[PDB]
C-alpha cells in the first residue's frame, strides 16, 4: 500500500446535502473505500479514525478499535454509510477538526505516530475563521492536514491555505481535487503524495 508508516489517520468525510444522494452512493462512499484501500491498516502501521460531518461531526470508526487496524472491518463500516439518511445538511468542518483535537487533548492518539487529517469535501466550511483556528491548533500539535476537493462547490485557495500551501502557486502535495465522475482515478496518486509528505 502507498501509505505504510506509523500514522494515526483521521478521515473527515463531508456528508453535506450538496453532494446529492446519487453521488453519495456512486462516488463518495466508493471513494472513501478506495482511500482506505491505500492504507496499511495494522497495529504497527496505520490506525484509522473516521467521522462524517455536515451539521455536526459524527464518529463512525473509533481510533485504535478493531476497524481502525483492519481494512476489511473498516470497509464494512464505510459501506454501511449507504444504508442511512445521508447526505444532508451544511459543512461544519470546524466541528470535525475539533473532534480530532479532542483526541489529542485526551492523549488518545499514539504519541509516537505521525498525525494526519484527510478531509474529503465538496464545499467551503460554514466558518472559514473557526476552521482555520482549529487547523492552527492542530498544526501546533504536529498534525498535518490534507484535502481532497470534489466538484464545483469547493474553493481551491481556501483548501490550499488549510493544508499549508500558497493559495495558487507551486506544488501542493497535500491537496488534490476531482470532478465527481473521476474521484477514483485521483485518490491513489493523492494518497501516495500525501503519505510521501507525511514521511518527510
Ligand atoms: Cl465550519
Ligand atoms: Mg466551529
Ligand atoms: Mg457541500
Amino acid at each position: 500500500e502507498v501509505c505504510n508508516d506509523e500514522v494515526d489517520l483521521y478521515l473527515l468525510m463531508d456528508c453535506s446535502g450538496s453532494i446529492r444522494r446519487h453521488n453519495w452512493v456512486k462516488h463518495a462512499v466508493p471513494l472513501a473505500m478506495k482511500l482506505i484501500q491505500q492504507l496499511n491498516l495494522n497495529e504497527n502501521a496505520i490506525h484509522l479514525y473516521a467521522n462524517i460531518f455536515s451539521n455536526n461531526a459524527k464518529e463512525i470508526i473509533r481510533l485504535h478499535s478493531d476497524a481502525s487496524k483492519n481494512k476489511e472491518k473498516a470497509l464494512i463500516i464505510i459501506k454501511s454509510l449507504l444504508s442511512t439518511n445521508l447526505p444532508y445538511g451544511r459543512t461544519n468542518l470546524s466541528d470535525a477538526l475539533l473532534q480530532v483535537r479532542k483526541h489529542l487533548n485526551d492523549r488518545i492518539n499514539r504519541e509516537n505516530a505521525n498525525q494526519l487529517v484527510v478531509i474529503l469535501t465538496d464545499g467551503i466550511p460554514d466558518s472559514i475563521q473557526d476552521s482555520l483556528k482549529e487547523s492552527r491548533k492542530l498544526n501546533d500539535r504536529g498534525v498535518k492536514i490534507a484535502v481532497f476537493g470534489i466538484g464545483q462547490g469547493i474553493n481551491v485557495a481556501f483548501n490550499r491555505f488549510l493544508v499549508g500551501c500558497h493559495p495558487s502557486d507551486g506544488k501542493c502535495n497535500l491537496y488534490a481535487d476531482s470532478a465527481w465522475e473521476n474521484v477514483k482515478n485521483v485518490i491513489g496518486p493523492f494518497m501516495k503524495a500525501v503519505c510521501v509528505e507525511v514521511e518527510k
Side-chain angles (χ1 to χ4, degrees), residues 9-53:
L9 192 162
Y10 307 83
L11 177 61
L12 315 191
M13 181 177 189
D14 177 331
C15 62
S16 59
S18 62
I19 291 176
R20 308 296 177 79
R21 177 68 179 179
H22 64 89
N23 283 327
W24 181 253
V25 167
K26 296 308 272 183
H27 304 297
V29 166
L31 171 61
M33 291 178 80
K34 190 157 180 179
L35 178 160
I36 288 164
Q37 290 176 320
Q38 308 311 303
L39 311 176
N40 182 20
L41 296 190
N42 188 277
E43 186 67 62
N44 270 313
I46 310 290
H47 293 198
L48 182 69
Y49 161 92
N51 72 35
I52 54 175
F53 72 92

Side-chain angles (χ1 to χ4, degrees), residues 81-101 103-135 137-151 153-170 172-192:
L81 293 172
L82 296 170
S83 311
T84 63
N85 65 348
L86 296 175
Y88 75 82
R90 56 185 189 79
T91 313
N92 195 346
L93 179 59
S94 65
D95 193 49
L97 292 168
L98 175 57
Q99 301 318 302
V100 174
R101 188 166 63 94
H103 287 71
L104 305 181
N105 188 77
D106 294 359
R107 208 173 309 273
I108 305 304
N109 66 297
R110 293 175 293 170
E111 290 181 313
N112 204 69
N114 292 313
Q115 305 291 308
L116 172 61
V117 167
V118 179
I119 291 151
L120 309 183
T121 192
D122 86 327
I124 298 153
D126 293 326
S127 173
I128 289 165
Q129 194 74 26
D130 204 41
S131 288
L132 287 172
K133 179 159 156 177
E134 287 298 326
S135 73
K137 287 180 191 188
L138 294 174
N139 288 337
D140 281 353
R141 287 172 174 265
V143 176
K144 284 193 173 158
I145 303 174
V147 175
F148 186 94
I150 310 169
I154 56 170
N155 188 266
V156 172
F158 171 80
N159 293 339
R160 287 175 65 101
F161 281 133
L162 194 66
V163 305
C165 291
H166 191 274
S168 59
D169 305 338
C172 185
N173 290 317
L174 293 178
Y175 180 63
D177 57 40
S178 183
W180 272 108
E181 55 265 38
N182 195 222
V183 292
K184 282 174 80 182
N185 303 131
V186 182
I187 191 61
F190 169 73
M191 288 312 289
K192 189 181 187 164

